[model samples]
Target: PTETIMHANDAIQKTTASTRKPRLVVMVVGETARADHASFNGYQRATFPHMDKLIGLGQVHNFGNVTSCGTSTAYSVPCMFSYLGAEKYDVDTADYHENVIDTLDRLGVAILWRDNNSDSKGVMNRLPAKQYQDYKNSPLQGGNNTICHTNPYDECRDVGMLVDLDDHVKAHANQDILIVLHQMGNHGPAYYKRYDDEFAQFLPVCTSSELAECERQTVINAYDNALLATDDFLKQTIDWLAAQTHADTAMLYLSDHGESLGEKGVYLHGMPKAFAPKEQLSIPALLWLGADTPFAVANSPTAGFSHDAITPTLLNLFDVSTQATADKTAFVNPLD
Candidate 1:
């Protein structure tokens, strides 16, 4: 039955010859990164210096006021990838339907999913074979212990997702590809564990996972430091993409959900969306396009964008035609 659904769905989705050159799209699925803490989003702290530099150079587009589809990873990750918009999304039936990932695969884009987070939340389940790596319990073998050690939590640092990524990209230089890097970004009560010592610029960070025991400022400091590490990861990712001469490359990053740090007694994410604090819904969304990608951002409004835009933006960027494409929601517009 799954095979039948896949074939039926693929029949309706049409792919035209790309008007632009072959492109590489790296989609970074961030975990628990709130927009309010991002420097580019007007945060007082310099948590995003590297990303800020890219924004300043006009190479990256920082969408300041973006909302996520859900407040938890299990709900948001699948919802974001589904053709069904947030309002219409139902977890019970979501699994059986084809998602943007499936659509892209049918469109002939080589896909790779590298997860350093809990999992893809069943988003990649419909793929023909397992094409994802789960580094949640087992960090990549031969990874640097200093960077990928399982100390604070039994999880590897986000850098582990980049292991040998260059070689993989180089090997597929001639084909259009999509690489999804799922980060364990700022997922905590143990925020301090998310980053390395070099990113621990913020002083007096909360080292304990028990949020109630830590000072509010200390907790914020730890969270901000994690953001710094995420910034560095993204900077390195963009730098690597920029160096690629084989295909027009771009990177799109959006968090699956945001976290609540001891605000009104809330420590982590996954609160019901209705009454959930704004912190859990407000997430950072960023895009960086290589010089020759043949695509550009349209005039972006200061507010009113959500995860529904993701599918259409990707289809539009790659010039894939489908009944699922919702042009009005796409945050990025193709060059006229």
Candidate 2:
């Protein structure tokens, strides 16, 4: 862990202000969402109307085959950010390493975190971090002062984070910015509580958290509703980014890990990766570069990728160089 942090620091020490326009990277870290349920990945339900529509117009890249590093949020969250790939990953070791945020922060990149999820698993401790619950009674939250539409859960909609995102990005126009929006997307058990009633597009949703008691199809209905809501949130985010005419903007969204949907009696995430089913390991990933953004990416819909690709891809995107290794794990390689 010490060596990893030191190596990342070494890279940061060499960074210079990018010669081109300042980059705006908005990384949306989704909670329990799986690829098999998303419409863009060939699911029967229409889960991603907004994103799929954008992809239809050649505006986004949907990487269809992405395997997560772990099967739960606690494991996958840190793993995705760490330099250690899945084979050698350890949560204890990862806790002590300098991740993508640390190196980017050292390079004077403005890093901020807006989380609607329970926690970022210590990922945002060194950055300007805020949870939606913390927004209560603050000037930012304004009229929506309640913790959430549904009480007691304290789970605000992912849209709550967007209220500050636009202004936050605008405030740092002079420097490279990375804003991570940690979403409460389709989290299990209480799946029915994830979205508002307006998103009840599917019938017969599972209103209870007792997975073993709820009908499988109803549980799916609730899960799909939350997934649809996530699509709606991302659509709003894309619109916000498109209006940001002052910067070179890009957005990347991927789940921390996949969820289990009653297959072989498994209800939620956290199974061992080695024995986890495909639904619990496969994740959906999306990338979008604003129409006028200063960067480009080749769309490889069927290419296989993993959480390990994130660190290198992001480093390459920031135009930050590091010590040589023959790893071609980055999704955005030869980052010209």
Candidate 3:
């Protein structure tokens, strides 16, 4: 396939950028991830060894919140990524009318979207959906990029997704690129559905997706195990990116919303906007991109950011140096 071009000079300019305007932007939007579940965050299970490492190397927003308009995969993610954001329930025609890749193409950024999550709906309707892959476990097999829900809640597939990104980063180092790896993530009550058949590493595994009456502790165990698998994936990805010879790489992990594991009469996150609880609205958010990241910001003051500021913050980080809307605050220096 012909490579995408964000702008003519983008190639020239990206080549010159070293200290400022990172050459690569890698965002791994993990699904249904919570704020306090990872072992890094002091959870009982070691579900996030790699994320823990990244957190130490970057920032950790311990209290970040998600303002999703809806809690279901079909509605929340797409709505969050819309120009109107969560406050505006309806999708803006102007934003939806034109393709997001079209905009990125103009920016001179090569955009390659890999969807292990629900088909990346937030940017799907806006970009070319043909570029994504859905390898849900079972050893890197190929599938028709078709799905009822593009994103699933499995972490095992995420490992494969990371491998794909590592390959892309290695192969296309000369071009400025954007690779989005949407994890099958931690969606529930099918949390166990996110892992592989043999994680003998974690004993007492429940390989069932029918999360109806499974023991809460068992469900949490399965989910945590999946997270552990995700941690493994992240560790491999970051290590590879850190050593990539093609382009400079950085990663950010976020969730559109959280899940309610029998909390306040809530078991999942498909409720309507009004019905969704804080568990479904207030989710975990974290970012760690750059060669020499200042651990203070990622772990403390700078960690205080929300999904609302993400789009513009990233645009700024990518050197989309322009006056942004008032709702945004610059979280990253595009020109460091």
**Using Cα atoms with residue i matched to residue i, what is each candidate's TM-score against the true structure?**
0.90, 0.89, 0.75
lDDT of each: 0.80, 0.77, 0.56
- Please list the residue runs of candidate 2 whose C-alpha ends up more than 4 Å from where it truly belongs after superposition: 1-4, 12-18, 128-147, 150-154, 298-303, 324-327
Candidate 1, position 187, lDDT: 87
In model 1, which regions exceed 4 Å deviation?
Answer: 1-20, 128-130, 137-147, 150-155, 301-303
- Across 204-313, the per-residue lDDT of candidate 3 in tens digits comes to 55556655566666766777776776667666666656775445555666677677766755677777667567667656665655566422232224534556555655
Give candidate 2's error at residue 73 in angstroms. Answer: 0.6
Q: Residues 42-66, candidate 2, lDDT per residue (tens digit)?
A: 9998999888888888898888868
Question: Can you write out model 1's per-residue Cα lDDT over 1-336, one digit (the tens) per residue?
Answer: 344234224323333335446778899999899998989999999999999988988889988869988998899998888788888888777787778788887767778888888777777886754467665554345323234554555457787777677766666666678899989899887888888788889999988988898889999999999999999999888888888776778899999988888789888889988899999999999999898667777666556788888887777666666555635568678433
* Winner by TM-score between candidate 2 and candidate 1: 1
Tell me model 2's lDDT, rounded to 2 decimals: 0.77
Q: lDDT at 187 for candidate 2?
A: 86
Off by over 4 Å in 3: 1-22, 56-69, 89-102, 125-130, 134-156, 164-167, 170-172, 197-212, 293-304, 324-327, 334-336
Candidates ranked, most accurate by lDDT first:
1, 2, 3
Candidate with maximal lDDT: 1
